Scaffold this active site. Sequence first.
Site, PDB file in Angstrom:
ATOM      1  N   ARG A  57       1.800  -0.734  11.234  1.00  0.00           N
ATOM      2  CA  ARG A  57       1.867  -2.067  11.392  1.00  0.00           C
ATOM      3  C   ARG A  57       3.194  -2.413  10.131  1.00  0.00           C
ATOM      4  O   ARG A  57       3.140  -1.806   9.157  1.00  0.00           O
ATOM      5  CB  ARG A  57       0.690  -2.786  10.773  1.00  0.00           C
ATOM      6  CG  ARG A  57       0.819  -4.221  10.718  1.00  0.00           C
ATOM      7  CD  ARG A  57      -0.623  -5.226  10.685  1.00  0.00           C
ATOM      8  NE  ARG A  57      -1.178  -5.091   9.512  1.00  0.00           N
ATOM      9  CZ  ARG A  57      -1.311  -6.265   8.550  1.00  0.00           C
ATOM     10  NH1 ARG A  57      -1.126  -7.534   8.926  1.00  0.00           N
ATOM     11  NH2 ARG A  57      -1.653  -5.972   7.516  1.00  0.00           N
ATOM     12  N   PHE A  62       7.316  -8.218   3.892  1.00  0.00           N
ATOM     13  CA  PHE A  62       6.311  -7.957   3.502  1.00  0.00           C
ATOM     14  C   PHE A  62       5.626  -6.605   2.974  1.00  0.00           C
ATOM     15  O   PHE A  62       5.867  -6.460   1.969  1.00  0.00           O
ATOM     16  CB  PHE A  62       5.231  -8.827   4.272  1.00  0.00           C
ATOM     17  CG  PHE A  62       3.539  -8.568   4.045  1.00  0.00           C
ATOM     18  CD1 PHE A  62       3.132  -8.499   2.758  1.00  0.00           C
ATOM     19  CD2 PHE A  62       2.738  -8.495   5.038  1.00  0.00           C
ATOM     20  CE1 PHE A  62       1.766  -8.490   2.520  1.00  0.00           C
ATOM     21  CE2 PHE A  62       1.266  -8.359   4.798  1.00  0.00           C
ATOM     22  CZ  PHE A  62       0.842  -8.411   3.627  1.00  0.00           C
ATOM     23  N   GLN A  65       2.731  -0.501   6.841  1.00  0.00           N
ATOM     24  CA  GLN A  65       1.363   0.091   6.538  1.00  0.00           C
ATOM     25  C   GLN A  65       1.152   1.273   7.303  1.00  0.00           C
ATOM     26  O   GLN A  65       1.419   1.381   8.563  1.00  0.00           O
ATOM     27  CB  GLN A  65       0.159  -1.173   6.998  1.00  0.00           C
ATOM     28  CG  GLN A  65      -1.226  -0.831   6.858  1.00  0.00           C
ATOM     29  CD  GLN A  65      -2.229  -1.766   7.409  1.00  0.00           C
ATOM     30  OE1 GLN A  65      -1.880  -3.110   7.920  1.00  0.00           O
ATOM     31  NE2 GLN A  65      -3.569  -1.544   7.456  1.00  0.00           N
ATOM     32  N   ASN A 103      -7.619  -2.006   2.684  1.00  0.00           N
ATOM     33  CA  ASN A 103      -9.193  -1.929   2.619  1.00  0.00           C
ATOM     34  C   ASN A 103      -9.632  -2.871   3.667  1.00  0.00           C
ATOM     35  O   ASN A 103      -9.188  -3.489   4.481  1.00  0.00           O
ATOM     36  CB  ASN A 103      -9.584  -2.017   1.218  1.00  0.00           C
ATOM     37  CG  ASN A 103      -9.478  -3.498   0.542  1.00  0.00           C
ATOM     38  OD1 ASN A 103      -9.750  -4.506   1.435  1.00  0.00           O
ATOM     39  ND2 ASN A 103      -9.247  -3.482  -0.558  1.00  0.00           N
ATOM     40  N   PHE A 114      -0.095   1.061   1.939  1.00  0.00           N
ATOM     41  CA  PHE A 114       0.977   0.226   2.276  1.00  0.00           C
ATOM     42  C   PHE A 114       2.052   0.112   1.106  1.00  0.00           C
ATOM     43  O   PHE A 114       1.684   0.372  -0.028  1.00  0.00           O
ATOM     44  CB  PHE A 114       0.776  -1.349   2.604  1.00  0.00           C
ATOM     45  CG  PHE A 114      -0.016  -2.060   1.535  1.00  0.00           C
ATOM     46  CD1 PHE A 114      -1.497  -1.854   1.370  1.00  0.00           C
ATOM     47  CD2 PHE A 114       0.526  -3.091   0.615  1.00  0.00           C
ATOM     48  CE1 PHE A 114      -2.318  -2.782   0.332  1.00  0.00           C
ATOM     49  CE2 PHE A 114      -0.235  -3.744  -0.259  1.00  0.00           C
ATOM     50  CZ  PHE A 114      -1.712  -3.600  -0.288  1.00  0.00           C
ATOM     51  N   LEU A 123      -2.265 -10.314  -3.295  1.00  0.00           N
ATOM     52  CA  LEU A 123      -3.184  -9.484  -2.997  1.00  0.00           C
ATOM     53  C   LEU A 123      -3.629  -8.928  -4.279  1.00  0.00           C
ATOM     54  O   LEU A 123      -4.545  -7.770  -4.288  1.00  0.00           O
ATOM     55  CB  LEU A 123      -2.537  -8.206  -2.447  1.00  0.00           C
ATOM     56  CG  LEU A 123      -1.759  -8.891  -1.032  1.00  0.00           C
ATOM     57  CD1 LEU A 123      -1.113  -7.372  -0.467  1.00  0.00           C
ATOM     58  CD2 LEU A 123      -2.546  -9.216  -0.147  1.00  0.00           C
ATOM     59  N   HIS A 127      -6.559  -5.171  -3.997  1.00  0.00           N
ATOM     60  CA  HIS A 127      -6.207  -3.835  -3.306  1.00  0.00           C
ATOM     61  C   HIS A 127      -5.849  -2.972  -4.640  1.00  0.00           C
ATOM     62  O   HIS A 127      -5.197  -3.675  -5.468  1.00  0.00           O
ATOM     63  CB  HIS A 127      -5.068  -3.834  -2.477  1.00  0.00           C
ATOM     64  CG  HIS A 127      -5.427  -4.776  -1.134  1.00  0.00           C
ATOM     65  ND1 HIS A 127      -5.472  -4.160   0.033  1.00  0.00           N
ATOM     66  CD2 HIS A 127      -5.605  -6.080  -1.084  1.00  0.00           C
ATOM     67  CE1 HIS A 127      -6.004  -5.200   0.717  1.00  0.00           C
ATOM     68  NE2 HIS A 127      -5.904  -6.272   0.108  1.00  0.00           N
TER      69      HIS A 127
END
Lengths: 166, 11
Positions: A57, A62, A65, A103, A114, A123, A127
Site C-alpha cells: 500500500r 502520506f 506500508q 496496527n 510504514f 497518528l 502507532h
Amino acid sequence: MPVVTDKVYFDITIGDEPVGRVVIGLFGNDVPKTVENFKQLASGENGFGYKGSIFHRVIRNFMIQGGDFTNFDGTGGKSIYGTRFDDENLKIKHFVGAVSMANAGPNSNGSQFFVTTAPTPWLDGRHVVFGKVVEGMDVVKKVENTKTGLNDKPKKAVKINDCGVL
Amino acid sequence: XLLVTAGLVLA
C-alpha cells in the site's frame, strides 16, 4: 530527538528493476522490544521475516506500508513474540521519514510497518514510532511515486529484494 | 481519512 542505536537496510526493486537502498535507524534505547522485533525480521534469524516481502500500500504525500510477509496484502504478518504484541511507548511523535508500526487498534503490533513521507501528526499516540530513515530518502521518494491501482496497490511489485542489519 | 491498519483500512 530519540537516539539511533542500530541500523537496518532494505534493497528495493520496483517491477524487478533495482531502485536503491533505504537505511533505517532504530530507537533501541526508547522502544527496545519493538526494535528487537524489527531487527530480527530484517535479519530473518527466526526463519521468517522481511526479505522478499512487498510494500502492498503506497499513498503519495502520506506513507508507504509493508511488512506483511504472510499474506502480502496487509491482513497478515507476525512478530517474533507470536502473532501480536503490546504497544511499547506511544510518546514518540511522528515526523517526515518516521518508521512506525501499523496496527489494528490497541496492542496489536505484528510485522507491518510504514515510512511516512510528509507530516502525520493525527497518528500520534496511536502507532508506535520506533525508527527513522537515515539514508535513502530519494529511494523512499521513488516508491511513493509508483503508479497504483485498487486500494493503493502498486501496479509493479515493490519488493524488499534483500535486507539485513548494518 | 488517512490511516495505517492491518486488515480493514478506514476513511
